[PDB]
Design a protein around this ligand. Structure first.
Ligand SMILES: Nc1ncnc2c1ncn2[C@@H]1O[C@@H](CN(CCCNc2ncnc3c2ncn3[C@H]2O[C@@H](CO)[C@@H](O)[C@H]2O)CC[C@H](N)C(=O)O)[C@@H](O)[C@H]1O
Length: 273
């Protein structure tokens, strides 16, 4: 039976999966196959619920009739999994990739958690494009790159339960980048303590890697006491349209996700070309 999740479809999920969908839609503009690599893939999909963070996330987005055209692909995948019109299922990143990728493209998904891996495996049991491995995700940035197709989106989306996640993401990014330097790397991060993020970003600059874009949506100002008040996406080699797309949808997302106007929503270069 599909996993229940209290956090699935929260504002962080809306931003991450928005960005994942747009990157994927950009890579589909060329006929040649690409790889979708998901270092930390989770269960695949989530049974929702009135409680659950989704009420303040995807529920405030998916039935809006002023949807910016940039969200259509993402929201269309959510609708696919809730055809009766009642918000009951949220697709994880592997399923957004499963629905958006074409016949020719490939998926490589790892999940270590023994409760989620078997669910994740059955989601691709009949999909000859996809492989699912019970492996450490960070190790995949060495073992699976470059893809044979030499095109790809790599999503690095660890739990950040262990504070070492903030260093592993960066060294893993540098490991994969040396091997596949034209790939698009998307790193999801949460803002719990802002000092954590300043250090991680400083470590990313220290690698010298170029073309690093930062997309961050905050539902409250930085705090010392309130858990995750913001999340972001850091994109190495973003498709050329991504920055203008995010400038278009980010204020909209913030408007609908945070009526009170707390927090912020920003697109900026950590490191330009
Ligand atoms: N706290 C959570 N617990 C369980 N599920 C959660 C939680 N937060 C979000 N999710 C949902 O699974 C998420 C990710 N997914 C698998 C679940 C990974 N396991 C987690 N373990 C402990 N803490 C987690 C976890 N995930 C986020 N946190 C965070 O807790 C934050 C506040 O929220 C921060 O402090 C941070 O520590 C990856 C699948 C794939 N890459 C995809 O994109 O789906 C995410 O997508 C969301 O849907």
């Amino acid at each position: 039976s599909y996993r229940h999740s209290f956090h699935a479809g929260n504002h962080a999920d809306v931003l991450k999966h928005t960005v994942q969908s747009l990157i994927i839609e950009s890579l589909k503009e060329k006929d040649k196959p690409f790889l979708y690599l998901d270092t930390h893939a989770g269960a695949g999909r989530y049974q929702l619920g009135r409680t659950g963070k989704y009420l303040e996330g995807i529920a405030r987005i998916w039935q809006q009739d002023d949807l910016p055209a940039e969200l259509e692909a993402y929201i269309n995948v959510v609708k696919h999994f809730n055809r009766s019109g009642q918000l009951r299922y949220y697709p994880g990143s592997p399923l957004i990739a499963r629905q958006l990728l074409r016949e020719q493209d490939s998926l490589q998904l790892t999940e270590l958690h023994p409760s989620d891996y078997p669910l994740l495996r059955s989601e691709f049991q009949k999909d000859s494009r996809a492989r699912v491995e019970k492996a450490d995700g960070f190790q995949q940035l060495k073992a699976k790159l470059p893809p044979v197709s030499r095109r790809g989106l790599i999503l690095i989306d660890p739990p950040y339960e262990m504070k070492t996640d903030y260093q592993a993401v960066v060294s893993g990014i540098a490991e994969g980048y040396k091997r596949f330097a034209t790939g698009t790397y998307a790193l999801w991060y949460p803002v719990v303590l802002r000092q954590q993020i300043k250090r991680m970003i400083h470590d990313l600059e220290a690698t010298g890697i170029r073309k690093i874009l930062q997309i961050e949506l905050a539902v409250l100002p930085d705090s010392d006491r309130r858990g995750m008040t913001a999340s972001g996406m850091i994109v190495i080699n973003p498709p050329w349209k991504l920055e203008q797309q995010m400038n278009n949808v980010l204020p909209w997302l913030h408007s609908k996700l945070v009526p009170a106007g707390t927090g912020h929503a920003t697109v900026s270069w950590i490191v330009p070309e």
